[PDB]
Design a protein around this ligand. Structure first.
Ligand SMILES: Nc1ncnc2c1ncn2[C@@H]1O[C@H](COP(=O)(O)OP(=O)(O)O)[C@@H](O)[C@H]1O
Length: 292
């Protein structure tokens, strides 16, 4: 039973058309904005949920206004039954787009071009003092308009954590931190209950790109967090690069050397994607796999 039924109207403005997503922490709907006449995304969480994450989501989404790869903030509110955020509506997510591919793989062209946009999104959130902590294909969606269909948008800021403080400094990490994010894309550090850093969001991007190009990860079928962590610890990460562009060794080595305290070298990773494209004769203007 959905939190909101079809045609329910939020704050005399947003009319629920259909449920477009959900699972963790609540549900997301496509709604008609009765004031502006545009289709929007309405994200809701029940007010009786023990962990309320929309307060974080709203704060991060507002802090990100003006950045590329981010939904326009439309509104938000709270009541006794539910909390909500209203934002720009996008198209299909990357997990859905990958699963729809014949072999569940994207071409290197699509993989590398998505990698550039996701890396830019990751650098954008870190630049406002926040870690995403839940980097995964379903938290990235393509635009749905002729002016936005080749733009990839970063979604879901509910599990975000501010690593900076009021004075523009980096706060000390806690001695221990509860597991946050997806099991499939979490770094080994996240599995060990270490405080997550900027490098951990880059580990999730590394695993996503391997999954995009290869179609699977070695721990794909395992659901248990601990069993997955053991596989990732034991697994020779160089074996993940068998079918990857050779400059991915540079990406892997850089992230493997980082800790919570060290600012990543985002340009080093960008250079890996750019050289991988040029060495293959891949143009930036190429159509994405799903366009064909
Ligand atoms: N602005 C949006 N436009 C289009 N689809 C969206 C939007 N926000 C979320 N979704 C869809 O619903 C799912 C949304 O959940 P999301 O905010 O990403 O995470 P969650 O349900 O894990 O808190 C996504 O994978 C995507 O398909």
């Amino acid at each position: 039973a959905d939190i909101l039924p079809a045609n329910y109207v939020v704050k005399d403005r947003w009319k629920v058309l259909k449920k477009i997503g959900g699972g963790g922490f609540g549900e997301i709907y496509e709604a008609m904005d009765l004031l502006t006449r545009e289709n929007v995304a309405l994200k809701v969480e029940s007010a009786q949920q023990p962990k309320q994450v929309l307060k974080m989501e709203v704060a991060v989404l507002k802090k990100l206004q003006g950045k590329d790869h981010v939904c326009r903030f439309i509104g938000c509110g709270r009541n006794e039954k539910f909390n909500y955020v209203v934002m720009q509506l996008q198209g299909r997510n990357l997990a859905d787009l990958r699963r729809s591919q014949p072999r569940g793989t994207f071409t290197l062209s699509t993989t590398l071009r998505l990698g550039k946009q996701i890396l830019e999104s990751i650098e954008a959130i870190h630049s406002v003092g926040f870690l995403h902590r839940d980097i995964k294909p379903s938290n990235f969606a393509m635009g749905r308009l002729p002016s936005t269909y080749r733009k990839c948008y970063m979604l879901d800021f509910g599990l975000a954590r501010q690593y900076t403080n009021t004075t523009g400094d980096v706060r000390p990490p806690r001695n221990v931190a509860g597991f946050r994010g997806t099991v499939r894309y979490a770094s080994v550090n996240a599995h060990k209950n270490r405080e997550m850093g900027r490098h951990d969001d880059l580990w999730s991007l590394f695993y996503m790109l391997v999954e995009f190009a290869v179609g699977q990860l070695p721990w794909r079928k395992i659901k248990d967090k601990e069993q997955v962590g053991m596989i990732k610890e034991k697994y020779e990460h160089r074996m993940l690069l068998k079918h990857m562009p050779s400059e991915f060794h540079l990406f892997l080595d850089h992230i493997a050397s980082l800790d919570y305290f060290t600012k990543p070298d985002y340009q080093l990773i960008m250079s890996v994607f750019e050289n991988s494209m040029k060495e293959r004769g891949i143009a930036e203007n190429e159509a994405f796999d799903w366009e064909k």
